[PDB]
């Protein structure tokens, strides 16, 4: 079995932990406990292949430990809350830091817009997410909800597919 090391990054309260836990355990985390650093191991079939995912659930609220995430991780999910405008703005500097630390403009990645089930609460429209995805060397993009299990599997699937090239 081939291991893929994946990293979930983004500002506090966006749903990195909820996305990870939904993917790995199949339950929805309601409580808000800010993560320090959780790690998960899940086996998936991704295109006729048995893959072993190590997924790093990182801290929103720890710049010291951040450099090690980026040096060792092969795939990165950058996650924002469609509810929270600021969370989107903070992603720009995350992209640039991954690229700075790895020294390549060609890193497997996916821009994740979380909380799409909170439709009556949008502050970041799908257009905004695509426009940045475009600017980011035409990077991959999804809107997701960890509550209703929408594109949750996609996030980590797409990442594996990308490393596979």
């Amino acid at each position: 079995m081939r291991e893929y090391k994946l990293v979930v990054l983004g500002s506090g309260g966006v749903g990195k932990s909820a996305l990870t836990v939904q993917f790995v355990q199949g339950i929805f985390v309601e409580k808000y406990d800010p993560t320090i650093e959780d790690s998960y191991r899940k086996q998936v079939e991704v295109d006729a292949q048995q893959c072993m995912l190590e997924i790093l659930d990182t801290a929103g609220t720890f710049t010291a430990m951040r450099d090690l995430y980026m040096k060792n991780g092969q795939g990165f999910a950058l996650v924002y809350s469609i509810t929270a405008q600021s969370t989107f703005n903070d992603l720009q500097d995350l992209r640039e830091q991954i690229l700075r630390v790895k020294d390549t403009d060609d890193v497997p990645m996916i821009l994740v817009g979380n909380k799409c089930d909170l439709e009556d609460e949008r502050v970041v429209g799908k257009e905004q997410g695509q426009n940045l995805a475009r600017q980011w060397n035409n990077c991959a993009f999804l809107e997701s909800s960890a509550k209703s299990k929408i594109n949750v599997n996609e996030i980590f699937y797409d990442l594996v597919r990308q490393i596979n090239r």
Binding site: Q25, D33, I36, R41
Partner: protein, 103 residues
Amino acid sequence: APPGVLKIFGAGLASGANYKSVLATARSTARELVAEALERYGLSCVDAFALCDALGRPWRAEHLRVLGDSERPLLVQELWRARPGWARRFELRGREEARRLEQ
């Protein structure tokens, strides 16, 4: 006295979990962290669980030591190392099974 992060491993405690991390000061205790980790894996109950200094290599812990309630685990981590060749981790285990595996 620097505040580092401790990776607490769940030796069969929350499905596909590997470790949950916990911030620890030089004044932090085992029991304070067993409390912080238990509500982190989502599991007083505190009394029946134990923070453990596990050693193995290349998994299966070849030997472990259960930490005393008063002990400061940041110092246990930072001031000692495993045998060269051997790996080391902190482990949250039920007290019964932890004491059982010391002998």
